[PDB]
């Protein structure tokens, strides 16, 4: 067969050890989910430094904790705006997930709190920038470089899916690079506990699985489709399905056709055809052998999965870092006040935050 006796035994043992790790991690997650944390700091405990990111969600600021000198990324959400945009459940869900998970590639929430006007989630500052920026600047990542990042996503999804969490938000924009060159996943607003199926239309056009577009019930396999999109985009420099407008993107996604750059290896194309598989019955990550079809694929043959988890692999790329509080790997944004009203807003809606 493909493996001789020693390799087959080693692989089997490794796969059983994964099961043992995940069972313990699920026990720990459920204990923390039952009994969270809350109101663990306040605004005047931090110095505001610079805005690192913005969106309809609100803003993320680099802050420095006054007592410890530690830098953090503080996400600030305007409660009234969260309500107007119908994001109450997503915001509460994001905090509850972040509070309960623990994995080397998932950003750590250190504090959370709220005032009359805003919600605050204070996370570890990830100083290396967005994968998106590096990808657009470099153009494309070599297959080994793409593989290093892809392996981290595979392990992260293996973890999240064991907790029955579907991620639903994968894209280079949502992946940050830490000081050692490893990935941090950060955005959990669209993540959901789904042991079975779910139905919400959500995600980013280029990364949507066909069954989402086609308004079907869907499952964790959408994350494996999205991994295929990510690997393709990392290795090509552009995603597999693009067009001027989302509707035309969706027509390409559902077609069952994908084309590859001539520089893609045959191993990469084989993996991608099995991830970018329209037929759920055939998609890698959704078959009887689960995540193992991906981890044992030829394209990952050089990947030492435990060494990646342990962060013992030398990263192919280390972002520039001049010291704590270096913001140079992020863009510049207009600095705006953070006003907090003398009147509590939306207390009932956010009572559990």
């Amino acid at each position: 067969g493909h493996m001789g006796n020693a390799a087959a035994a080693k692989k089997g043992s490794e796969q059983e050890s994964v099961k043992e790790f995940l069972a313990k991690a699920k026990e720990e997650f459920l204990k923390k989910w039952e009994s969270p944390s809350q109101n663990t700091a306040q605004l005047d405990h931090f110095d505001r430094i610079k805005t690192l990111g913005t969106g309809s969600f609100g803003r993320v600021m680099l802050v420095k904790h006054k007592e410890t000198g530690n830098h953090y990324a503080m996400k600030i959400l305007d409660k009234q705006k969260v309500v107007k945009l119908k994001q109450i459940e997503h915001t509460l869900n994001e905090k509850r997930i972040l509070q309960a998970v623990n994995f080397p590639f998932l950003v750590k929430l250190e504090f959370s709190f709220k005032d009359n006007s805003n919600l605050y989630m204070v996370m570890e500052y990830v100083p290396g920038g967005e994968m998106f920026s590096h990808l657009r600047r470099i153009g494309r990542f070599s297959e080994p470089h793409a593989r290093f990042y892809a392996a981290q996503i595979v392990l992260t999804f293996e973890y999240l899916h064991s907790l029955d969490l579907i991620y639903r938000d994968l894209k280079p924009e949502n992946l940050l690079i830490d000081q050692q060159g490893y990935i941090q996943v950060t955005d959990f607003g669209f993540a959901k506990r789904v042991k079975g199926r779910t139905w919400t239309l959500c995600g980013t056009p280029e990364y949507l699985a066909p069954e989402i577009i086609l308004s079907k019930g869907y499952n964790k396999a959408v994350d494996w489709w999205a991994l295929g999109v990510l690997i393709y985009e990392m290795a090509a420099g552009y995603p597999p399905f693009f067009a001027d407008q989302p509707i035309q993107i969706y027509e390409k996604i559902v077609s069952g056709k994908v084309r590859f750059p001539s520089h893609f290896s045959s191993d990469l194309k084989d993996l991608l055809r099995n991830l970018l598989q329209v037929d759920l019955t055939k998609r890698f990550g959704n078959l009887k052998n689960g995540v193992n079809d991906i981890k044992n694929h030829k394209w990952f043959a050089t990947t030492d999965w435990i060494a990646i988890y342990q962060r013992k692999v030398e990263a192919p790329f280390i972002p520039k870092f001049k010291g704590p509080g270096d913001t140079s790997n992020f863009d510049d944004y207009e600095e705006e006040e953070i006003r907090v009203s003398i009147n509590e807003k939306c207390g009932k809606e956010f009572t559990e935050f």
Partner: peptide, 20 residues
């Protein structure tokens, strides 16, 4: 080229999710 088609799409910047 396919790269030129990507540039022509106008979707080379940060992409928003559907709900935006």
């Amino acid at each position: 080229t396919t790269y030129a088609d990507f540039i022509a799409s106008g979707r080379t910047g940060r992409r928003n999710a559907i709900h935006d």
